[PDB]
Design a protein around this ligand. Structure first.
Ligand code: CHB
Ligand code: CHB
Lengths: 263, 265
C-alpha cells in the first residue's frame, strides 16, 4: 500500500484468502473489519507514527468509541479489494477514521466505513479530550475540507442506539476471549466484539439474509479474565438491537444495531 | 504465488499484518498455520483442484488431516515478507503428505518447516479408507517422484508416537467453544482452532519467558459447532516440554493429543 499523491489518504490492495471467507464463499464482516484496521495501521506508519510525540509524553492513547460499516457486496475468495482510508479532526471531542472499499477490477464501491475515536489516559482510562498542542501535530496529515465516507445530512452512522431491555429474544452466553483474540498490547481487539454481537443472531437469519449494516458503540473494554453475554432482539429487511454485557454483574461493554437484506 | 519451474511445488510470499502478531511483535503460530493452509489451498487451485480429485468427488471421498507437525526457528516480525514453498507426496495406500518450508524473503534463510499426514475419508459416513489406484494415478502427476522431505532426519520428531495424558492434568482450560469465525466455508471447525485450544492450557508464565519451537498434533475426531472442549496440559521435562489433550467437556471423548517444545527467550 501507499499514500496517495497529495499525502492526505492511504490506499492498499488485499487478495481475499481461503480462510477469510464464510459459508457463502465471500469475506466475512470479521475479515473486512481486520482489513480496515490493517489499512489504518499502515496509514499511521507511513506518516510517522497511532500516538503523537506529546501523546506518548502524557501517556494518552486513541480509543475507538464508535464503528459503523456498510457493505453492498462482499468480496469473493481470490478477488482483490482496494481500501482507501483517511483521518479527520472533529474538534476537541476527538478524531474520525473513514474507509472506502472498492472492487479492484470494476472500480465500483462495494462498501464504506466510519469510526469515532476519543483520547484517554492509558493508565487511569479517563477521557482527557483533545488539546490544541495535540491537534496541529496530526492536522497536517488530514484533509482540510470535510471528506466524509457517509456525507448525507443525518445518515445511519450518527444514529442514537438505545439499551436492550430484558428479556432478550436471542442470546449467546459464556463468551470468553482467547490468546488469539488479543493484540500485541494484550487488549481484546475491536473485531472480537463484532463477532460476539453476531453470535446471538439466529442461524436462520444467517442462512437466508446477508449483513448490510452494522453500527457498534464501545462503552467499556473486556479483559482476558472477563466473560461476555451477547443479547439480541428483532426490532422490525430484518433489523436487530444488540447488547454485550459482563456475564456476572451485567456491566455494559457494547450496544449496536444490524440491518440484514434477503438473499 | 506461483508454481515453480518444474510444476512440482508452489511458492507464495506473505507480508505479516498488524493483527497477525502477538505480544512479542512477531507472527503467532495460529497465523503461521493459517498461512500454511492458504499456500496449500492455492497450490491445489493452480493444479486443477477445488483438494478432491475427479474420482474422489464421484465417490464422496475427501482428504482429512490426521497429523500436523510445525517447527519454527524464527517467527517473522510485523511487516516482514515470508516465503512459503509447499509440495504434496503420495505415501502409497496410507494417504498423502503435505510439506512446507518457510523462509525470510530478504536473507533467504530457513525460519521454519512443517509436515502433515492426510488420509482419505467418506464425507458422509466419516469412514476412513485406503487410497485406491484410480485416485493415486490422478495426483502422482503433481508430486515429485523422488522423496522430498521437509524433515529428512533418521530420528525426526514428526514421526514420534504421542501417548494419552492421564488425569489429573497439571494445567487446564475448561469450556472452550467454537464461534462462527472458527468455521470454514463448509461449516467445519478450522484445524488452526485446535492449535489455539491446545495452547490455551499453557500457563502464562511459560508464554512470557519462552517461545514455542515445536508443536506436533494428532487429529482423532472433529469438534462440532454444538460441542464443548476441555484443554489439558502436563509438563514432561533449558527447554520446556508439555503433553496435551483435547476432549469433549461432557463424556470426555478424545478429539486431539499433542506435544509442545518451548525454548527460553
Ligand atoms: O459463515 C458465515 O456466513 C458467518 C461467519 C461469521 C459470522 O459472524 C456470521 Cl453471522 C456468519
Ligand atoms: O500473543 C501471544 O504471545 C500468544 C498468542 C496466541 C497463543 O496461542 C499464544 Cl500461546 C500466545
Amino acid at each position: 500500500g501507499s499514500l496517495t499523491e497529495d499525502g492526505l489518504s492511504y490506499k492498499e490492495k488485499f487478495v481475499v484468502r481461503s480462510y477469510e471467507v464464510g459459508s457463502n464463499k465471500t469475506a466475512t464482516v470479521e475479515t473486512i473489519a481486520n482489513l480496515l484496521q490493517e489499512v489504518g495501521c499502515n496509514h499511521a506508519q507511513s506518516v510517522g507514527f497511532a500516538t503523537t510525540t506529546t501523546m506518548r509524553k502524557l501517556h494518552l492513547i486513541w480509543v475507538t468509541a464508535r464503528m459503523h460499516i456498510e457493505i453492498y457486496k462482499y468480496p469473493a475468495w481470490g478477488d482483490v479489494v482496494e481500501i482507501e482510508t483517511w483521518c479527520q479532526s472533529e474538534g476537541r471531542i476527538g478524531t474520525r477514521r473513514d474507509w472506502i472499499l472498492k472492487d479492484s477490477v470494476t472500480g465500483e464501491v462495494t462498501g464504506r466505513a466510519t469510526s469515532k475515536w476519543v483520547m484517554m489516559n492509558q493508565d487511569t482510562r479517563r477521557l482527557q479530550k483533545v488539546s490544541d498542542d495535540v491537534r496541529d501535530e496530526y492536522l497536517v496529515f488530514c484533509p482540510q475540507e470535510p471528506r466524509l465516507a457517509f456525507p448525507e445530512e443525518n445518515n445511519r452512522s450518527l444514529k442514537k442506539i438505545p439499551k436492550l431491555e430484558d428479556p432478550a429474544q436471542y442470546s449467546m452466553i459464556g463468551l470468553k476471549p482467547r490468546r488469539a483474540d488479543l493484540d500485541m498490547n494484550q487488549h481484546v481487539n475491536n473485531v472480537t466484539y463484532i463477532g460476539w454481537v453476531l453470535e446471538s443472531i439466529p442461524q436462520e437469519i444467517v442462512d437466508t439474509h446477508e449483513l448490510q449494516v452494522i453500527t457498534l458503540d464501545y462503552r467499556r473494554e473486556c479483559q482476558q479474565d472477563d466473560v461476555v453475554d451477547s443479547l439480541t432482539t428483532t426490532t422490525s429487511d430484518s433489523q436487530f438491537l444488540h447488547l454485550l454485557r459482563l456475564s456476572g454483574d451485567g456491566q455494559e461493554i457494547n450496544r449496536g444495531t444490524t440491518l440484514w437484506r434477503k438473499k
